[PDB]
């Protein structure tokens, strides 16, 4: 694959260029807050974000090398985790609040608390945008990989490239070899907590995009 | 803003560019006149939020009062949406790319009565930009001119501050002209070619205003209010 020959810098450049825009909530600010339904607003936002997520996924190196079926499977497994890491990233510089959108910024519940905790953890780590995009791409490629042979092999190789990229970013930033491996581990372990939150979030919803919806979106 | 170089002006404008939004996903097809109009309204309204963010980053714009910023936006918003539309559609002959998932040929334009006429005008503008090889750096200059120009001749005056406001706007406009010329000189165009291409691009602006006026006459037959615009700017 062409993707496997990308350097660290090229991988970061591709990922930064692929980033979705930050969307706004769809509601008239001239109106009182009480008119709105929180769940309604969040659903409308998420649905609009999903279209952009598909476009983003198609630009993650290696992703289009996969079958349409496997692309859908990865997206089905990752979509809420991807929405959540986006949320936490946007909320980093807003302690005690979740920036669902620039016009939908909420203070303090169980999952909300978990997301806030993740956000504060990213803030304490001084998580950089270049690291963020690597991590969100890992979520895409990893979350569904163990629930599907050449397809899996390819995915694992792209994942290894992403690891290389994360280390490269850290070496470039001035971190010692010991600091690099420690920060690599810290970042990746936070992914287990993102999985946790996603599963808890799913259990709350039960709005969820179907295999078929995702397939149609990818085809279109 | 008046201390920016041409290159800095271009950089600021490129960095300010809004995202390309999507239409309401999976609408009923075929469209009715009502459903198409509904989709276009929904799109436009979402684009407007991002336009405000963009406007606030156009050098010189925030130097104006909130009132004057709203006045400019009131006069320019549809023209700005339309030059965006024509720019997005350049590489799609015979079609208008309202959004990546809403790409319509003239046949589909006929779905709303009287619309095909303006659809044709927009297609014509888009082909004109394509034939001229309009550059992204030129596009952002032009869209910024629309913002600052369209409402400039319909402010009140009388007051010293108001005369200074208009003067400032005109100075920013002159800087944008300088920037356009700079881009052309940098590209290797002769002085005569530069002045000709400048005039061609600005004359196309009169046609964009025309199409905007025709488009506005349909919307009034949806339009963001002074209050909505002011709130968006404040937020
Ligand atoms: O965990 S949730 O259930 C779920 C995650 C988050 O909130 C919901 C949601 C969503 C996603 C898709 C959708 O269709 C609707 C909502 C989220 C989302 C949307 C867009 C995005 O960019 C990022 C996240 N949840 C947690 C809380 F907010 F409280 F912290 C929650 C629970 C009860 C509510 O009443 C409200 C929300
Ligand atoms: O180009 S438009 O002028 C403008 C484009 C699109 O439609 C408008 C619009 C919009 C904006 C806000 C909104 O809320 C709804 C729609 C558009 C927009 C939205 C987002 C965006 O990024 C770009 C554009 N246009 C479409 C085109 F002809 F070109 F195809 C158009 C032209 C003629 C019409 O009728 C004439 C006949 N009529 C006259 C009066 C009596 C009854 C008969 C009708 C529409
Ligand atoms: Cl949007």
**Complete DSSP assignment for A163-190:** HHHHHHHHHHTT--HHHHHHHHHHHHHH
DSSP label of B47: H
Binding residues of A: 49, 90, 204
Contact B86, B223 (CB under 8 A): no
User: What is d(CA A59, CA A3) in angstroms, rounded to the nearest whole number?
Assistant: 11
User: What is d(CA A61, CA A158) in angstroms, rounded to the nearest whole number?
Assistant: 8
A21/chain B closest Cα distance in angstroms: 6
What residues make up the domain containing A166? 1-220
Q: For a substitution probing ligand 2, which of B118, B121, B125, B209 has the most ligand atoms within 8 Å of its CB?
A: B118
Q: Cβ contacts (< 8 Å) between A43 and chain B: which residues? A: none
Domain total of chain B: 1
Q: Where are the alpha helices (DSSP H) in A58-172?
A: 68-91, 110-125, 129-142, 150-172
User: What is d(CA A123, CA A8) in angstroms, rounded to the nearest whole number?
Assistant: 24
Distance B42 CA to ligand 2 centre (A): 12
Residue B123's nearest CA partner among B81, B92, B80, B79 is B92
Chain A / chain B CB contacts < 8 angstroms: 31
User: What is d(CA A190, CA A131) in angstroms, rounded to the nearest whole number?
Assistant: 13
User: What is d(CA A100, CA A83) in angstroms, rounded to the nearest whole number?
Assistant: 10
CB under 8 Å to A102, separation ≥6 — which residues? Answer: A22, A24
In three-state secondary structure terms, B116 is helix
Residue A152's nearest CA partner among A211, A218, A66 is A66
Contact A8, A169 (CB under 8 A): yes
CB under 8 Å to A122, separation ≥6 — which residues? Answer: A88, A89, A92, A190
User: What is d(CA B69, CA B155) in angstroms, rounded to the nearest whole number?
Assistant: 11
Q: After which residues is chain A broken (C to N over 2.5 A)?
A: 108, 148, 206
Q: Taking the CB of residue B107, how many other CB atoms lie within 10 A of it? A: 10
Closest chain B CA to residue A28: B228
B4 φ, ψ (degrees, to nearest 5):
-65, 140
Contact A91, A98 (CB under 8 A): yes
User: What is d(CA A43, CA B89) in angstroms, rounded to the nearest whole number?
Assistant: 30
Distance A12 CA to ligand 1 centre (A): 29
Q: After which residues is chain B broken (C to N over 2.5 A)?
A: 221
Burial of A194-217, coded b for 16+ CB within 10 Å and e otherwise, reads: bbebbeebeeeeeeebeeebbbeb
**Which experiment gave this structure?**
X-ray
Closest chain B CA to residue A220: B101
Which residues lie across from B103 on neighbouring strands? Answer: B97
Q: Taking the CB of residue A42, how many other CB atoms lie within 10 A of it? A: 17
CA nearest ligand 2 atom 34, residue: B115
User: What is d(CA A142, CA A151) in angstroms, rounded to the nearest whole number?
Assistant: 12
Residue A91, classified by CB atoms within 10 Å of its CB into exposed (0-12), middle (13-18) or buried (19+), is buried
**For the domain that residue A31 is a member of, what is the CATH number?**
1.10.565.10
For residue B30, is the peptide bond before it cis, meaning its omega torsion is within 30 degrees of 0? yes
Longest pairwise C-alpha distance within chain A: 55
Q: For a substitution probing ligand 1, which of A24, A43, A46 has the most ligand atoms within 8 Å of its CB?
A: A46
Pairing state of beta strands A104-107 and A97-101? antiparallel
B205/chain A closest Cα distance in angstroms: 29
CA B38 to chain centre: 21
């Amino acid at each position: 694959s062409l993707a496997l020959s990308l350097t660290a810098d090229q991988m970061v450049s591709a990922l930064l260029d692929a980033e979705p825009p930050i969307l706004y909530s769809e509601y008239d600010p001239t109106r009182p807050f009480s008119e709105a339904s929180m769940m309604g607003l969040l659903t409308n936002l998420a649905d609009r974000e999903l279209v952009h997520m598909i476009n983003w996924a198609k630009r993650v190196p290696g992703f289009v090398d996969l079958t349409s079926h496997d692309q859908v499977h990865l997206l089905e497994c990752a979509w809420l985790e991807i929405l959540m890491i986006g949320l936490v990233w946007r909320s980093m510089e807003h302690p005690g609040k979740l920036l669902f959108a620039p016009n939908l910024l909420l203070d303090r519940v169980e999952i909300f608390d978990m997301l806030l905790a993740t956000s504060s953890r990213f803030r304490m780590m001084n998580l950089q945008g270049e690291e963020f995009v690597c991590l969100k791409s890992i979520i895409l490629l990893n979350s569904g990989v163990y629930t599907f042979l050449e397809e899996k092999d390819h995915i694992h190789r792209v994942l290894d490239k992403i690891t290389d990229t994360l280390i490269h970013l850290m070496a470039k930033a001035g971190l010692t070899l010991q600091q690099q491996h420690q920060r690599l581990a810290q970042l990746l372990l936070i992914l287990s907590h993102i999985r946790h939150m996603s599963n808890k979030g799913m259990e709350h919803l039960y709005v969820v995009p179907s295999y078929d919806l995702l397939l149609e979106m990818l085809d279109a």
